[model samples]
Target: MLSGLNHLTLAVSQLAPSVAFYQQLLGMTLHARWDSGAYLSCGDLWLCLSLDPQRRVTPPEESDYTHYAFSISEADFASFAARLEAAGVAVWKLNRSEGASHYFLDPDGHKLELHVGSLAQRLAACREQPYKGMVFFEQHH
Candidate 1:
């Protein structure tokens, strides 16, 4: 049975710029490169970037709710936010009680996130909501 995600691959419009973005901007370290793609690492997660404009789907017009976030250190959160914006990446601030998180788009409009803590902890933190929080706890229990 599958246990967890070992890697994620993204179809990008361009290879070099995409690799540069993940490396220069996102701080992901690159380990290897192919003629058509690159392999990068983020906290043991392998991210494969492939140049595939003909097969890639364009992102929606608005991406407010479409994103996958990573857990980030509180100590580096502010700097990350600032650095992302400084690199001209459009940042989004979502409303959630668990504290601030950084959301942005990778090349090809793949939404990426830098959030704090695990999903369980985040769900528990929202346990004060009128019904939603209680329902989450009840269902899990």
Candidate 2:
């Protein structure tokens, strides 16, 4: 049984910009650092941004839907979204029946998301809809 998520590690092209983007924009605090990675904290959540100069990263197009989403206050969604777009971050909308989200990217071409509601809210909102897709795990070779 899964208790909870411990952390998420992201392979990055470089460190500084990703670190800055997450901290300055998302309010994550620098918890620690090493030669290859930096740790950021948001409440009890930890996000590890790691340097991998050889990693090939590509930007996600509208159809490349895989992304990592962070929870945001519903009340702060509009103002925050506008302010983010205003400050040179590329922003796009992902219209979900449960709740709307802003799909964006980090400096290293990694797709990211800011969601307006909790998982419970999304699940409750989805009760009326039928499943549209299947979940699968294909090992990356």
Candidate 3:
């Protein structure tokens, strides 16, 4: 029933650092900025950073698996990884699934990922190495 993601907003403890991280490090285009909030865009995603005095800047717990993922091109994957490393962003998780991907944390310690595959590709991989009792709802393409 959902059409698509309209936008995503994150509460940031500090504005400048988070703005710089999203704009420079993540290569998002800055649309607007103010004392309490900033707006940026990458691809089709509109990301907003809102200043929050009560926001937590601590890293997510090890058991917390929730994260936001962005898509990357397979051709640009290598250079993008290098770009992130040069910018000193540390990888928070390793890929153990179908295609290439790496997880990292944002300036506010929010988990994020850069992945180079699609849902269709992931489903194909799952069929090849089906989980113990996994069931498919639709026929393979």
Q: Which candidate number maximizes TM-score?
A: 3
Decoy 1 TM-score against native: 0.82
- Once fitted onto the true fold, the runs of candidate 1 whose alpha carbons sit more than 4 angstroms away are 55-65, 130-134, 137-141
Local accuracy of candidate 1 as per-residue lDDT tens digits, 17-83? 8999999888889999998899999996898998886745445465446667777888999999889
Best by lDDT: 3
Model 2 agreement with the true structure over 1-141: per-residue lDDT tens digits: 997889988888878878888988877898888879899987767899999987666745533666788888878888878877887887555655566588777787777888878866656556556467834343657
- Pitting candidate 1 against candidate 2, the one with the higher TM-score is 1
Give the range of the ten consecutive residues with the poorest summed lDDT in model 3. 57-66
For each predicted model, how many residue pairs clash, with residues at least 3 apart or on different chains? 1, 0, 0
Tens-digit lDDT track for model 3 on 1-141? 998999999999999999999898888999999999999998999999999998877666643787899899989888887888888887788889778897888887888898988888888899889998998899547
Computed on alpha carbons, the lDDT of every model, listed in order, comes to: 0.78, 0.77, 0.87
lDDT of 3 at 51: 97
TM-score of each: 0.82, 0.81, 0.90
CA shift of 8, model 1, Å: 0.6
lDDT of 1 at 138: 64
Evaluated against the true structure, the overall lDDT of model 2 is: 0.77
Query: Candidate 3, 85: how far from true, in Å?
Result: 1.8
